[PDB]
Amino acid sequence: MFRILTINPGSTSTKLSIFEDERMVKMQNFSHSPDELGRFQKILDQLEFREKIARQFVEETGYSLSSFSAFVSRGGLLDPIPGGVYLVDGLMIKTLKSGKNGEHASNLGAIIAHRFSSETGVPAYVVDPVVVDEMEDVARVSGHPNYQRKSIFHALNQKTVAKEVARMMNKRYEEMNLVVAHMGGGISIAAHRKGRVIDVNNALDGDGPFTPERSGTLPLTQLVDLCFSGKFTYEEMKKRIVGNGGLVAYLGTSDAREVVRRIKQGDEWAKRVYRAMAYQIAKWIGKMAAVLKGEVDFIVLTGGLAHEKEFLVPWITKRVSFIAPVLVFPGSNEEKALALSALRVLRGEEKPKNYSEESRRWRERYDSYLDGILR
Amino acid sequence: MFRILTINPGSTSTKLSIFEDERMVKMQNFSHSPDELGRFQKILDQLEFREKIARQFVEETGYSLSSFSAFVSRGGLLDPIPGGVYLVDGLMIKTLKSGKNGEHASNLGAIIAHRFSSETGVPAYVVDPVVVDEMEDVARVSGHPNYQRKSIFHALNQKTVAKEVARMMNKRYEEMNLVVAHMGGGISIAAHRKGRVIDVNNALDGDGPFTPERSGTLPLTQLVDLCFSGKFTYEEMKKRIVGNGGLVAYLGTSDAREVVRRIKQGDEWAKRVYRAMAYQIAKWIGKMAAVLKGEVDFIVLTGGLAHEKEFLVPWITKRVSFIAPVLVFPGSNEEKALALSALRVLRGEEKPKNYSEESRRWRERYDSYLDGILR
Ligand SMILES: Nc1ncnc2c1ncn2[C@@H]1O[C@H](COP(=O)(O)OP(=O)(O)CP(=O)(O)O)[C@@H](O)[C@H]1O
Ligand SMILES: Nc1ncnc2c1ncn2[C@@H]1O[C@H](COP(=O)(O)OP(=O)(O)CP(=O)(O)O)[C@@H](O)[C@H]1O
Ligand code: NA
Ligand code: NA
């Protein structure tokens, strides 16, 4: 019986849970109000504030941090790496604290687990960071030398549902081909070729179909124009990619249930914009089908939007069932996903990756690719 | 027997030809050197220069402009309109001369035909302008209210090959479903649903797969960043979408035959970038397949790149034949295409559209769509 602690720091919340083997024994979401949050200049300044909530969470359990077998955290903005469960080390910490790859609340998670680790000797891990990158070189070329397509998406949910589909039919994730569509506030559509995400859109940076809250890919010219059109507000213009865009920008809401209600009342602009979102998701799924050369076992719809079975799901299904049957796996459980990955490691069913080495192996391969600087 | 004159003004050249029914009797390309061309401030200033070449072309024929039955020109940057053959009228001229929709050498063609028309009484037409737009509303939504997907591509070649495929099997263009891929210096991939191009990428404005000379769609964030990174050269940064991008930017050449030669010599970066271009064309064809809900009769590869049957064509075919069989229709004949469209009209096999009315009908429909300004 292994007792595990999962750490999941988000932009506006902090989720923690305790697992005893595969059974969850405690979980609590600690939301943070804009007020309470704006009290910090840089994101790193929240470090002690959030650690305090975690120590407190275990504290009022009667258990001590040394009674745990592992501490597991959501990855963060680490350098590109293959999927898997990594041991938190010195290089990871240095990178996270220096925000060399950007600052994000999720970076605090690994740091927090590491300290819990230095005080108890218990192992700390991070699994499937948002920077998981397992794509093929051909997918990196963008059309212009000083631009690269990068793999930045909800890799944890992707990998997790893919393995769930396999396990459901007692097959191996490694022997299938899938098109998995994670449709939440962010939308990533990935091509899984034999356990490897060979191509996917850069969801986190706003590339792809538009979402309930993001605008997704936008017209090039019209952009470079409205770019320096005086309307320049590096911030304002920058929030139209991850904050103020998509359904919320057209209908004034990012709640699908609200939008479906309107469609049932005869709202035509609402239905036209919602239908356009499904239309885009379908197109991208088509892109990924072409990536797999048509060899697709299943198309999987997952994420919050997969719950909407009256319009969205049926619309997508009609357009893409010619590629492969459609399977719906609604939602996503980050806590359970992280704890199980740590259990597999503790049970010796999976080998822990070493971020340090693993990062070098990746950069070495990427650097050989990047050697296109030869004129 | 109808004698027709075709006018085709390009960025750096001017092509004219004379058809007597379906037989071509004279054609000549008048290239214009950067020197000879830079002699004009605005594009409109070339008007008299190019008209002089056309009058001269007919001049040394022994024929007079009044012996013709029609004058046909390549469309230009007119307001959005459905496909077809239009009669050149006052509204078209006003729009072209004022460059309200942008300046382009192709705008001079209609103007030149109109004058030839005012002097002889003979009818002047423009067919399938680059601004043909027959897409469905759902395809217009971009993800953000002040951005629209527009249909701007090589509509003449598109429409022409589509009808050729049909005629080849004695069927009607109006009763088929096709995915036509025009792969030249510009790459447009369009979904033809029963004679109507319901969706296609904005090729002319750099949206889509990268081409031998254009970069195509680029990463959003990385763009908005490099946008105002001091490197700002509204011009320089603007030519990385239609002039300096794509294969030419990576390999230093936009000649596919040159690139194929390198691949045969073992060049690996060359092969990797070329293969990435095919890879992208395939993905977009996948997008259009999803637009047609999988109901695709044929996938058609046309344009210059369709000539390359050693690598490009076979690579695309492998990835997309699961959608529908692939047909290769290399090149494109603009002269023959324009003259035939005028012959059909002169023979009464096709009705001439009226740009004036046709433009209103289009804007009325678009304006109802654009009424999403209701909060
Ligand atoms: N039962 C339900 N019916 C219809 N829509 C639902 C739903 N439950 C959730 N949604 C919708 O699905 C969307 C996504 O929820 P999800 O939990 O995946 O998003 P997220 O807020 O966590 C952001 P991201 O996906 O980028 O992490 C929501 O924005 C909501 O509009
Ligand atoms: N026989 C051949 N074999 C291989 N490639 C060829 C070819 N003939 C032409 N090409 C290539 O195909 C590409 C397109 O020629 P195409 O005539 O369609 O282009 P274009 O210069 O007219 C520009 P656009 O398509 O935007 O009008 C060229 O850029 C060239 O590299
Ligand atoms: Na978008
Ligand atoms: Na591109």
Side-chain angles (χ1 to χ4, degrees):
Chain A
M1 182 278 271
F2 302 84
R3 171 173 296 157
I4 307 166
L5 180 78
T6 69
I7 311 167
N8 178 31
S11 309
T12 63
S13 72
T14 296
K15 278 186 283 292
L16 304 176
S17 75
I18 293 178
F19 278 73
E20 277 174 35
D21 280 351
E22 309 176 311
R23 308 176 196 178
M24 172 171 70
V25 298
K26 190 176 198 296
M27 101 79 67
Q28 195 174 313
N29 187 304
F30 298 82
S31 48
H32 309 313
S33 65
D35 307 299
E36 178 188 4
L37 205 65
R39 187 208 319 172
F40 306 85
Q41 297 296 293
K42 294 271 70 63
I43 296 183
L44 188 55
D45 297 310
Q46 303 178 56
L47 173 46
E48 194 58 51
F49 158 55
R50 307 221 191 192
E51 181 193 312
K52 209 267 295 176
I53 298 184
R55 287 178 179 297
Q56 223 164 58
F57 175 71
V58 185
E59 200 67 61
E60 308 186 67
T61 308
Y63 304 160
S64 62
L65 288 185
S66 64
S67 58
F68 284 68
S69 306
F71 305 125
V72 212
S73 178
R74 169 176 154 190
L77 297 176
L78 301 178
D79 296 307
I81 54 169
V85 173
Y86 296 74
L87 250 155
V88 186
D89 60 25
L91 181 62
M92 192 183 299
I93 271 60
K94 176 184 178 181
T95 298
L96 292 181
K97 291 190 178 178
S98 72
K100 53 170 294 185
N101 292 309
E103 299 190 61
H104 188 309
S106 49
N107 295 344
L108 305 183
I111 301 176
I112 289 177
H114 184 57
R115 288 181 181 173
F116 290 8
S117 193
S118 73
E119 293 152 32
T120 57
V122 174
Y125 310 90
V126 298
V127 28
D128 294 315
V130 96
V131 289
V132 158
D133 179 311
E134 313 182 307
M135 45 188 252
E136 289 297 318
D137 275 41
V138 63
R140 298 181 193 292
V141 179
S142 72
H144 199 309
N146 305 308
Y147 292 81
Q148 282 79 42
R149 301 187 62 240
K150 306 153 85 268
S151 176
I152 304 177
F153 60 126
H154 282 37
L156 188 56
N157 196 203
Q158 287 275 340
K159 287 287 179 187
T160 298
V161 299
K163 286 170 191 177
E164 280 176 39
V165 170
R167 159 168 51 269
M168 179 185 88
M169 320 181 108
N170 212 50
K171 299 190 174 182
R172 285 189 297 133
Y173 167 51
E174 301 63 41
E175 81 189 315
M176 297 181 97
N177 273 4
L178 309 160
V179 170
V180 181
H182 172 75
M183 356 195 268
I187 294 183
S188 63
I189 307 192
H192 289 260
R193 194 218 286 162
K194 304 302 167 55
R196 204 168 184 63
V197 175
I198 64 177
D199 199 342
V200 57
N201 59 304
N202 188 326
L204 302 201
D205 292 335
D207 289 286
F210 77 84
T211 73
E213 62 192 57
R214 307 182 191 175
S215 69
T217 296
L218 294 170
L220 192 57
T221 289
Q222 299 174 51
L223 192 76
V224 172
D225 280 35
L226 295 183
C227 202
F228 41 62
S229 177
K231 305 288 188 62
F232 168 63
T233 316
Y234 201 166
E235 249 296 66
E236 177 60 57
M237 182 173 83
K238 191 175 183 181
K239 71 176 301 179
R240 284 187 175 185
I241 309 173
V242 179
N244 177 59
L247 296 184
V248 68
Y250 288 89
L251 312 174
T253 181
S254 62
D255 183 304
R257 299 194 65 261
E258 223 289 293
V259 175
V260 175
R261 182 170 309 105
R262 294 195 201 172
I263 294 176
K264 291 187 162 307
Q265 310 181 73
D267 188 335
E268 297 187 307
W269 177 234
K271 182 170 190 177
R272 204 181 316 160
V273 173
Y274 194 53
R275 175 161 169 261
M277 187 176 71
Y279 185 77
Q280 284 193 24
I281 289 168
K283 290 165 76 160
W284 258 262
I285 286 176
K287 280 173 68 176
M288 299 305 102
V291 168
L292 292 169
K293 301 197 179 72
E295 301 295 299
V296 180
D297 296 310
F298 297 92
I299 292 179
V300 187
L301 309 183
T302 178
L305 296 179
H307 287 293
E308 206 282 286
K309 48 170 286 301
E310 308 186 59
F311 301 92
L312 195 67
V313 169
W315 283 336
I316 292 176
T317 297
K318 279 176 168 52
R319 321 197 76 98
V320 302
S321 60
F322 72 97
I323 291 159
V326 181
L327 296 173
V328 181
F329 270 68
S332 176
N333 192 317
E334 273 177 296
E335 285 67 66
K336 184 179 175 183
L338 298 167
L340 294 175
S341 301
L343 187 56
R344 250 135 49 201
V345 173
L346 290 165
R347 279 170 167 181
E349 316 182 318
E350 168 165 42
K351 270 296 299 178
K353 304 298 184 66
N354 176 294
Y355 177 67
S356 181
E357 302 186 67
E358 203 58 63
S359 185
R360 278 190 182 191
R361 296 297 98 67
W362 195 89
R363 192 169 56 263
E364 277 165 31
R365 276 135 55 188
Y366 181 63
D367 277 50
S368 69
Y369 159 86
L370 181 54
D371 285 310
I373 304 177
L374 302 179
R375 286 178 291 84
Chain B
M1 182 278 271
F2 302 84
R3 171 173 296 157
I4 307 166
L5 180 78
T6 69
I7 311 167
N8 178 31
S11 309
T12 63
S13 72
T14 296
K15 278 186 283 292
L16 304 176
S17 75
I18 293 178
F19 278 73
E20 277 174 35
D21 280 351
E22 309 176 311
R23 308 176 196 178
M24 172 171 70
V25 298
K26 190 176 198 296
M27 101 79 67
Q28 195 174 313
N29 187 304
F30 298 82
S31 48
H32 309 313
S33 65
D35 307 299
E36 178 188 4
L37 205 65
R39 187 208 319 172
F40 306 85
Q41 297 296 293
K42 294 271 70 63
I43 296 183
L44 188 55
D45 297 310
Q46 303 178 56
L47 173 46
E48 194 58 51
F49 158 55
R50 307 221 191 192
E51 181 193 312
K52 209 267 295 176
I53 298 184
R55 287 178 179 297
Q56 223 164 58
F57 175 71
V58 185
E59 200 67 61
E60 308 186 67
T61 308
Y63 304 160
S64 62
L65 288 185
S66 64
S67 58
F68 284 68
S69 306
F71 305 125
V72 212
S73 178
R74 169 176 154 190
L77 297 176
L78 301 178
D79 296 307
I81 54 169
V85 173
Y86 296 74
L87 250 155
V88 186
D89 60 25
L91 181 62
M92 192 183 299
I93 271 60
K94 176 184 178 181
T95 298
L96 292 181
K97 291 190 178 178
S98 72
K100 53 170 294 185
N101 292 309
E103 299 190 61
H104 188 309
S106 49
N107 295 344
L108 305 183
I111 301 176
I112 289 177
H114 184 57
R115 288 181 181 173
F116 290 8
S117 193
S118 73
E119 293 152 32
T120 57
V122 174
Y125 310 90
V126 298
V127 28
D128 294 315
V130 96
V131 289
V132 158
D133 179 311
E134 313 182 307
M135 45 188 252
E136 289 297 318
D137 275 41
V138 63
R140 298 181 193 292
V141 179
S142 72
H144 199 309
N146 305 308
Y147 292 81
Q148 282 79 42
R149 301 187 62 240
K150 306 153 85 268
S151 176
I152 304 177
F153 60 126
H154 282 37
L156 188 56
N157 196 203
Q158 287 275 340
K159 287 287 179 187
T160 298
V161 299
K163 286 170 191 177
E164 280 176 39
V165 170
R167 159 168 51 269
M168 179 185 88
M169 320 181 108
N170 212 50
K171 299 190 174 182
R172 285 189 297 133
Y173 167 51
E174 301 63 41
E175 81 189 315
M176 297 181 97
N177 273 4
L178 309 160
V179 170
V180 181
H182 172 75
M183 356 195 268
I187 294 183
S188 63
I189 307 192
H192 289 260
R193 194 218 286 162
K194 304 302 167 55
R196 204 168 184 63
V197 175
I198 64 177
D199 199 342
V200 57
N201 59 304
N202 188 326
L204 302 201
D205 292 335
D207 289 286
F210 77 84
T211 73
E213 62 192 57
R214 307 182 191 175
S215 69
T217 296
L218 294 170
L220 192 57
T221 289
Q222 299 174 51
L223 192 76
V224 172
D225 280 35
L226 295 183
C227 202
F228 41 62
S229 177
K231 305 288 188 62
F232 168 63
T233 316
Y234 201 166
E235 249 296 66
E236 177 60 57
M237 182 173 83
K238 191 175 183 181
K239 71 176 301 179
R240 284 187 175 185
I241 309 173
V242 179
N244 177 59
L247 296 184
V248 68
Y250 288 89
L251 312 174
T253 181
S254 62
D255 183 304
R257 299 194 65 261
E258 223 289 293
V259 175
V260 175
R261 182 170 309 105
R262 294 195 201 172
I263 294 176
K264 291 187 162 307
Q265 310 181 73
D267 188 335
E268 297 187 307
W269 177 234
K271 182 170 190 177
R272 204 181 316 160
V273 173
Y274 194 53
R275 175 161 169 261
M277 187 176 71
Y279 185 77
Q280 284 193 24
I281 289 168
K283 290 165 76 160
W284 258 262
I285 286 176
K287 280 173 68 176
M288 299 305 102
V291 168
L292 292 169
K293 301 197 179 72
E295 301 295 299
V296 180
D297 296 310
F298 297 92
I299 292 179
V300 187
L301 309 183
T302 178
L305 296 179
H307 287 293
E308 206 282 286
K309 48 170 286 301
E310 308 186 59
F311 301 92
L312 195 67
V313 169
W315 283 336
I316 292 176
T317 297
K318 279 176 168 52
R319 321 197 76 98
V320 302
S321 60
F322 72 97
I323 291 159
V326 181
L327 296 173
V328 181
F329 270 68
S332 176
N333 192 317
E334 273 177 296
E335 285 67 66
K336 184 179 175 183
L338 298 167
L340 294 175
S341 301
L343 187 56
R344 250 135 49 201
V345 173
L346 290 165
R347 279 170 167 181
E349 316 182 318
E350 168 165 42
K351 270 296 299 178
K353 304 298 184 66
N354 176 294
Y355 177 67
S356 181
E357 302 186 67
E358 203 58 63
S359 185
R360 278 190 182 191
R361 296 297 98 67
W362 195 89
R363 192 169 56 263
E364 277 165 31
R365 276 135 55 188
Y366 181 63
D367 277 50
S368 69
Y369 159 86
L370 181 54
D371 285 310
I373 304 177
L374 302 179
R375 286 178 291 84

